[PDB]
């Protein structure tokens with residue numbers, strides 16, 4: 001530490017790392033970049049892939065939100081107890097990222113016309129996660145193993161925004177509904193989710209959700 | 210071990226992990242799924258995300274090409290000397306994945322009409338890797354640290370298929386050109402790249418490259 005998140009004023013790709021830091025009792029500095037500032041073009045050319053999030057952990061500057069998430073998993077001890085678990089956490093986080101990729105394209109490229117087709121195809125995309133939970137202690141623990149990982153925080157965020165998009169999407173997925181309820185109730189996540197910083201922040205930049 | 214890769218008969222998302230295994234002196238089995246068998250629809254429901262590659266390592270079954278690569282990186286000691294390196298290698302590999310995703314979209318959905326635009330945009334996408342390399346020992350070693358890692362194989366594969374798509378795209382990138390040349394001359398990669406198995410396998414599934 002110290003931790004600094006540099007990002008646009010939206011939840012987007014930074015709300016899972018914010019929830020992880022909050023639930024682990026860490027504090028961080030939030031460096032908000034407004035669109036006017038981004039459009040001035042001084043910040044972008046200093047960013048490795050010209051995009052945000054940018055994260056600082058003391059000495060180390062990182063880019064790519066999943067690299068930042070895996071870094072926090074590795075350094076805060078949220079990456080499983082052994083290689084098999086870590087391999088499975090990666091498979092989970094990668095599946096999360098694929099659906100987050102589709103969600104971002106719906107929101108920003110085709111909200112109006114794509115929405116009903118997205119939501120109709122959503123159960124087939126949520127089913128893998130329900131299968132993984134049943135296979136792990138009947139869905140009563142975390143997505144991989146007995147302890148929380150970086151992957152849980154990223155999956156919870158993905159499910160929380162899909163419930164805003166399609167309110168009953170978890171009605172036929174009992175283990176995922178219970179998982180969402182369970183993890184949201186964790187004292188420090190529950191507190192973070194009720195914080196004005198989280199609440200005043202839009203999910204996406206274009207007003208859709 | 211044993212190692213088994215279950216994939217379509219194309220290079221696609223499995224040629225980087227094949228080069229990694231070959232260079233680390235491992236043997237593996239290829240279970241080839243043809244497109245006509247896949248379209249019968251019997252194997253797809255058994256895949257966690259309905260997709261291939263599927264990888265078997267002894268009794269661990271994995272899906273997601275980057276989870277498989279990170280797994281091999283972790284089990285074979287190709288993930289750096291410390292946490293700082295490990296985070297940097299993930300940042301590199303997520304940057305490779307972003308460009309691979311763009312490449313896939315070009316190839317399968319918009320080749321004839323998007324190629325010129327892609328190639329014009331490509332220098333701005335390769336410049337980060339050139340910069341990373343110049344900061345790591347003036348580009349004479351690997352992408353991160355002084356030992357090869359899973360990210361080097363994924364980056365090498367990305368640049369090799371881009372040299373097919375846009376011959377001479379590395380002309381303005383002296384360090385990436387020297388890098389490709391250096392890693393391609395590693396005797397076990399050199400053997401793999403001239404093997405008929407590799408040579409006769411198409412880069413992509415739709416005849417474009």
Ligand SMILES: CCCCCCSC[C@H](NC(=O)CC[C@H]([NH3+])C(=O)O)C(=O)NCC(=O)O
Pocket residue numbers: 008009010012013035044050051052053063064065066204205206303307
């Ligand atoms: C206006 C607020 C809403 C937009 C927020 C969308 S995420 C922002 C976008 N960055 C990314 O898409 C980063 C993707 C990267 N792969 C990651 O995982 O971190 C960006 O920096 N875009 C700036 C650019 O490309 O110029």
Ligand SMILES: CCCCCCSC[C@H](NC(=O)CC[C@H]([NH3+])C(=O)O)C(=O)NCC(=O)O
Pocket residue numbers: 098217219221222244253259260261262272273274275413414415
């Ligand atoms: C189609 C013939 C040529 C395709 C070669 C490209 S890989 C095929 C595609 N798989 C993927 O896109 C996997 C992406 C996944 N994120 C990964 O990294 O493993 C698939 O299984 N597609 C089958 C499906 O979706 O039904």
